[PDB]
């Protein structure tokens, strides 16, 4: 998931 990963969670997940 792109939510549980900091680099992508900066976007908005």
From Swiss-Prot:
For this chain, the annotated S-S bridges are 2-8, 3-13
> Per the record, what is the consequence of mutating residue 10 to A?
37-fold decrease in inhibition of alpha-6/alpha-3-beta-2-beta-3 (CHRNA6/CHRNA3-CHRNB2-CHRNB3) nAChR. 2-fold decrease in inhibition of alpha-6/alpha-3-beta-4 (CHRNA6/CHRNA3-CHRNB4) nAChR
* Cell compartments where the protein resides: Secreted
Q: Using the record's annotations, give every residue carrying the modification Cysteine amide.
A: 13
The post-translation modification note in this UniProt entry reads: The native globular disulfide connectivity of this toxin displays multiple conformations in solution. In contrast, the non-native ribbon isomer has a well-defined conformation. This ribbon isomer is inactive on alpha-3-beta-2 (CHRNA3-CHRNB2) and alpha-3-beta-4 (CHRNA3-CHRNB4)nAChR. Post-translational modification of Pro-6 into hydroxyproline [P49O] induces a 2800-fold decrease in inhibition of alpha-6/alpha-3-beta-2-beta-3 (CHRNA6/CHRNA3-CHRNB2-CHRNB3) and 6-fold decrease in inhibition of alpha-6/alpha-3-beta-4 (CHRNA6/CHRNA3-CHRNB4).
* Record site: Critical residue for distinguishing between alpha-6-beta-2/CHRNA6-CHRNB2 and alpha-6-beta-4/CHRNA6-CHRNB4 nAChR subunits: 6
Q: In which tissues is it expressed?
A: Expressed by the venom duct.
- The family this protein is said to belong to: Belongs to the conotoxin A superfamily.
Record function comment: Alpha-conotoxins bind to the nicotinic acetylcholine receptors (nAChR) and inhibit them. This peptide potently blocks numerous mammalian nAChR subtypes: alpha-6/alpha-3-beta-2 (CHRNA6/CHRNA3-CHRNB2) (IC(50)=0.258 nM) > alpha-6/alpha-3-beta-4 (CHRNA6/CHRNA3-CHRNB4) (IC(50)=1.54 nM) > alpha-3-beta-2 (CHRNA3-CHRNB2) (IC(50)=5.72 nM) > alpha-3-beta-4 (CHRNA3-CHRNB4)(IC(50)=27.7 nM) > alpha-4-beta-4 (CHRNA4-CHRNB4) (IC(50)=69.9 nM) > alpha-2-beta-4 (CHRNA2-CHRNB4) (IC(50)=121 nM) > alpha-7 (CHRNA7) (IC(50)=272 nM) > alpha-2-beta-2 (CHRNA2-CHRNB2) (IC(50)=800 nM).
Miscellaneous comment: Negative results: does not inhibit alpha-4-beta-2 (CHRNA4-CHRNB2) nAChR (IC(50)=10.400 uM or >20 uM). Exists in two forms, due to cis-trans isomerization at 49-Pro-Pro-50.
Q: What is known of its domains?
A: The cysteine framework is I (CC-C-C). Alpha4/4 pattern.
What is this protein's name? Answer: Alpha-conotoxin BuIA
Per the UniProt record, the source organism is Conus bullatus (Bubble cone)
